[PDB]
Symmetry: C2
Subunit: 449 residues, 2 copies
Amino acid sequence: TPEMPVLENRAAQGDITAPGGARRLTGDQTAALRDSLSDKPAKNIILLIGDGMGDSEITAARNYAEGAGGFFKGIDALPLTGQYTHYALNKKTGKPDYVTDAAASATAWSTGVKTYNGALGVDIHEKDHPTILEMAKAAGLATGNVSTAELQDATPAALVAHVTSRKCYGPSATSEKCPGNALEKGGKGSITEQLLNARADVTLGGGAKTFAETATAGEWQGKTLREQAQARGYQLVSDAASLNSVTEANQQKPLLGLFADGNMPVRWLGPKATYHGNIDKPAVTCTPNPQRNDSVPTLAQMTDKAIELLSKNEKGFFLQVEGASIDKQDHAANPCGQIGETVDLDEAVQRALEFAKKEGNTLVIVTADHAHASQIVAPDTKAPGLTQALNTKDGAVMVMSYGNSEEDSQEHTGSQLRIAAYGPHAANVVGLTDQTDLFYTMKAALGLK
Amino acid sequence: TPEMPVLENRAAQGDITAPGGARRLTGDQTAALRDSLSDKPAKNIILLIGDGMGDSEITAARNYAEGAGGFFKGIDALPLTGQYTHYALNKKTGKPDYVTDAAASATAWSTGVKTYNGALGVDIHEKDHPTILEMAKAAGLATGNVSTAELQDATPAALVAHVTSRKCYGPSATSEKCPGNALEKGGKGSITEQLLNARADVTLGGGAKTFAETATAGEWQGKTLREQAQARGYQLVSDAASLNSVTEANQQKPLLGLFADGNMPVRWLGPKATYHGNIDKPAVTCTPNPQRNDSVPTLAQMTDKAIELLSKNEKGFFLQVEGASIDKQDHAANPCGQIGETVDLDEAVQRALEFAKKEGNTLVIVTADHAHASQIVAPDTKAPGLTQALNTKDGAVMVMSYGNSEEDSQEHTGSQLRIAAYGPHAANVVGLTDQTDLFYTMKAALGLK
Ligand SMILES: [Mg+2]
Ligand SMILES: [Mg+2]
Ligand SMILES: [Zn+2]
Ligand SMILES: [Zn+2]
Ligand SMILES: [Zn+2]
Ligand SMILES: [Zn+2]
């Protein structure tokens, strides 16, 4: 069919010190872009969330990994781009809370309604709203939700659970934090419980431990959430090997991948940024993480199988893939960790585009939930916060900075950030939009009511 | 002719607390976007540089001025969008310097070659390269260069001067800082002298004092740079009233507007951010600047007249307009002063679009040289640097942070930033591009050799 181009090379054209050497473009876009514009309907949609992966996160990753004139074959390759707003809401006044958390933002792009920090699937009135995933499942479409964080953490949970607070993981915490939701108290239940009820075809990530809890009320009272899964049809896999033995993954044989007690281990090791570290200490070179066992699947691997299983549905599918720890390491002021994670995601995003071009009716979207702390500063910056110099692909030093908190956790920031898309309806992310528009853009491309 | 739509409303559709209330989109873009793609040649081009106005600077200003669900009629209204890279070069190794200054960046978009921080119109070998303005003048097109900074400052000087350091304002400093350029030493000369030789039709800004210097060598030796200007044909205006009396402005009657000794006064007052200021001090509300005399033209006012004068050329024109102090107040950790300047810029950008739509073959581009320091943080952020909470249009507090420097000057940052465009060839800004492409995009739109 009329193939929509996917940016093949936005890397520098040559000698960056020479005239025309640093150009990313080779010729005029007008035609190429025009060939990317389609209001055909998406058969499927894959949405890649780089948790806290704003433009600075992207630059620092490219800069370190592929060099300043380099180019991410996935993240940088989506043709249509824009910047979106992601403000949350103050619960009491319903006023904008300029800086959102994982909870409110996820709810935003999945239900189309703004909310307060810490909420999952509810508007500020605590009223429920159906998720893009739920709507899909009803339409007969296959659903998938992948992530490197515990499956209970906001971003993935936002598509299946409806709770007043995000801390309402499983049984124990919900009873004493989300009573109105508590199963025993007559509510729908904990995030975990609600996820198992949700029943999406493919659900992979960490968070094994919240499955150790036993239900209190309900049909499965007494038994651990784990057994309830199995008992209800769920195939349980815990490693690369078992993950590959799957062939079918459908409403009767849903796949539940629990690859870590909590979050999946980080891709790279590197010390954490320190006070004056860019000046008092040697420049860092990132290293692979010894701890991460070779049996723990990688985001791209997870993304790959999901796609392979999900693609079987004649109607189509929906898949959320999250590279969660970009944000986490960003909170930890740990460059190597964070950068490596963005790389991890780029890899997954590559795997998504590859399929996007072959199939031809897919919508690929890459973006973040919000902006974060890290900033690329000058080698000699003498800062008040946490810094650290890194040796980049170019053989140059690059200095990173964390200084928007004295609390030991570096904070999110409120800046608008990038949203790139490729395929049918990819046009709706261009210019300035709001994260809730993302929701509407998925519903309409997918032709959902 | 086929009119290209200019984003009329990306404000929220309604109640931000309700489902679909926070949306900026009202329908599908595909067609509207289609109707914006043209490879027709631009008759003219207007380039709006918000010095240091990256996405965080845009959000903070829209948040405070128009509210989070608000929309900038100028800045936010340009249909086509993308993110570009602006790294500079190390002079010694020709390696990437991840964080450029005003000088190198300006040089990148105007000549099309990367350079080291502090250079104006030279590559790292100190070899000269023609500017887009210079090329335009030769092509027979009208030229204009507008700024709120002293005309000598990098951003506006980059289009007419070729100096080893940006500190080579006029006579004195050049002799002792850019010997190879110094007139008497045989060189082309100081930035001022080079500007006066450049002879662009319209040149308005600040920097009156560098014109008090007297040339040393040359035809006009002994006399002050100012008399030389008059002696050569320049119409010298110094206020709104004189600026409006101009009718012609061309090669024989070139206009030179010097509206301030140095930089033009800022638009808004507001105190400077302080340590723990968001917690220790009351929330601030910006105020207009009392100092700013009513006779000092405003950026939009200046942009307006430039356009009016420049529009007279049957061939076309080229116009660089810079809102300079966004960056200057940003260095100063002064939210009210910084936001005010971004607003000041939006006003001028509106002017540009207004014309852009009427004429029909204009290319408008709005962007910044680099990213800067400010960050929108949480009301209760307990930070190491400079903070300050402000009362926004929403009636909510918005906290801003400055903490990438213990030096009393807040630093630039290397993050990739937005670049929106409207008109012929506006497509070439979509996706990831590099600041030097911007140079090639102007050259081909304007059909220059
Ligand atoms: Mg997450
Ligand atoms: Mg400037
Ligand atoms: Zn997040
Ligand atoms: Zn976070
Ligand atoms: Zn600057
Ligand atoms: Zn600056």
